[PDB]
Design a protein around this ligand. Structure first.
Ligand SMILES: [Cl-]
Ligand SMILES: [Cl-]
Length: 312
């Protein structure tokens, strides 16, 4: 039948609708909407009224699109901003009343697992031990695995909206800001360092909006005739990453707002995100970065198609 998946992310909500004919899935809708669920509240442990109202607006629109495609099987996941918010049940109950969708709140571990199922479908890793990283506005998930297995995974509440709200990063970034961020990452990421030492991944994979934007910027810079919508991976060399890093660290918020595809909430957090990627790169001896165009919503879909329960 047709399957609809909603990812209620901290910055951006996503809607994926897939038809599955002759056991082959085909995308009917892949839509996003900037919601800013974390704005004004995430580091203080709540969701604001304005953010809840934006969320409901977007969900009313997504409900129309679901109905316009006669979708029967729907699953809507709530992740970092939803699970973190003391008033999450207010939002969940408003959603049920307004559009008759039940939000499935998933913890960080399960979010990481589901993301990696999407990565496995997008990037054929063979037996290569790989570190995948998903940077969102609220959390960052890290998974070590290969085509068949997850060896280790962990979610950390260090998504970009949290980072820019908890710390004062200057516009543009200063040397002392770089010290601040990498010192913080040193403290937070100890379990990641330990896992990397244990499993020795040899490749780095990134997914979600920050990585999609880096890919799109690189495509434009090299004048590549590549629609990222029509392929499931994109390899970014380390020299290309370092060009983008230098460009974005030097940039102002206003300059970033002018980059094609760089939505406002991503412009706000992309510099701290690139600092985190650099930090992780120094821990791995990868040869390049592979961007997976699949992330949580695709992992949910493929988990469903596998015949496996999504929640937990
Ligand atoms: Cl926080
Ligand atoms: Cl967890």
């Amino acid at each position: 039948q047709r399957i609809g998946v909603i990812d209620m992310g901290t910055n951006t909500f996503h809607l994926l609708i897939t038809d599955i004919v002759n056991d082959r899935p085909h995308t009917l809708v892949n839509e996003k909407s900037a919601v800013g669920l974390g704005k004004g509240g995430i580091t203080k442990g709540f969701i604001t009224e304005e953010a809840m109202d934006r969320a409901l607006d977007t969900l009313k629109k997504f409900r129309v699109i679901l109905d316009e495609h006669a979708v029967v099987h729907v699953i809507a996941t709530g992740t970092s901003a939803v699970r973190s918010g003391s008033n999450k049940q207010v939002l969940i109950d408003r959603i049920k009343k307004e559009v008759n969708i039940d939000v499935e709140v998933i913890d960080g571990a399960r979010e990481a697992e589901l993301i990696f199922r999407g990565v496995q479908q997008a990037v054929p890793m063979e037996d290569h031990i790989s570190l995948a990283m998903d940077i969102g506005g609220g959390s960052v998930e890290f998974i070590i695995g290969n085509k068949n297995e997850i060896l280790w995974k962990q979610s950390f509440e260090i998504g970009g909206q949290r980072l820019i709200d908890r710390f004062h990063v200057h516009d543009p970034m200063r040397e002392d800001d770089r010290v601040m961020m990498h010192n913080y990452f040193d403290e937070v990421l100890v379990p990641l360092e330990k896992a990397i030492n244990t499993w020795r991944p040899t490749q780095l994979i990134g997914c979600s909006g920050t990585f999609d934007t880096l890919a799109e910027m690189n495509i434009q810079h090299h004048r590549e005739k590549i629609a990222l919508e029509k392929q499931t991976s994109y390899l970014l060399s380390l020299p290309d990453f370092n060009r983008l890093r230098k460009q974005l660290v030097a940039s102002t918020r206003r300059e970033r707002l002018a980059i094609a595809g760089m939505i406002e909430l991503r412009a706000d957090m992309v510099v701290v995100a690139i600092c985190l990627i650099e930090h992780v790169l120094k821990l791995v001896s990868t040869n390049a970065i592979t961007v997976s165009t699949y992330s949580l919503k695709e992992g949910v879909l493929y988990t469903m198609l596998d015949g496996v329960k999504v929640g937990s």
